[PDB]
């Protein structure tokens, strides 16, 4: 699963950033963020900051 089938002859290794697509045939990166402003595991620091 670390490689994507670029051609029917053999699978090809994808770059360090992208991960293989669900139905093979290439790979596309999916960006992520540092929790953004979401509720999970951010309410506690935000509260201890605002009340402080």
């Amino acid at each position: 699963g670390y490689q994507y089938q670029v051609d029917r002859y053999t699978c090809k290794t994808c770059p360090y950033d992208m991960r293989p697509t669900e139905n093979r045939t290439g790979c596309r990166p999916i960006p992520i963020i540092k929790l953004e402003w979401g509720s999970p595991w951010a309410v506690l620091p935000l509260f201890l900051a605002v009340v402080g």
Partner: protein, 150 residues
């Protein structure tokens, strides 16, 4: 300000030798076998730099504690010795609680969710302990008991 500059020089030195890369390529953790969730985002703030900062803070805390226990003979008007030692110990406890959770979750998921959150929580807890149990008794005496203010 001289004490601040003593660490500001080191901050500048570390900034120069080790610039803030802020690389988005934080793919060190990679669950590529399921190929479902992968990737991470984090600043380049180093664990060694954090350790150096905490060491400087702990040294300052030790000097504060030795000073507090040296100046214990001051009367009750300026007796800022027991609260200061208590605050030093509370900050030490907070940082000693921060160390295991921060330095143990290395080869595990949600490393960004754990490390940054626990670091900022520890910083906020130390600041809250210091501010509250340093000044809040005084504010209480001032504006809740207007009789000892003279």
């Amino acid at each position: 300000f001289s004490l601040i500059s003593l660490q500001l020089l080191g901050i500048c030195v570390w900034f120069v030798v080790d610039p803030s890369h802020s690389v988005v390529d934080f793919q060190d953790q990679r669950t590529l076998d399921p190929r479902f969730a992968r990737g991470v985002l984090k600043c380049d703030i180093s664990d060694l730099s954090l350790i150096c900062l905490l060491g400087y803070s702990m040294l300052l805390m030790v000097t504060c504690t030795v000073y507090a226990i040296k100046t214990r003979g001051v009367p009750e008007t300026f007796n800022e010795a027991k609260p200061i030692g208590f605050t030093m110990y509370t900050t030490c406890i907070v940082w000693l609680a921060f160390i295991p959770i921060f330095f143990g979750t290395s080869q595990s998921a949600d490393k960004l969710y754990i490390q940054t959150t626990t670091l900022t929580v520890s910083v906020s807890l130390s600041a809250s302990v210091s501010l509250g149990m340093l000044y809040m008794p005084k504010v209480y005496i001032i504006l809740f008991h207007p009789e000892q203010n003279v």
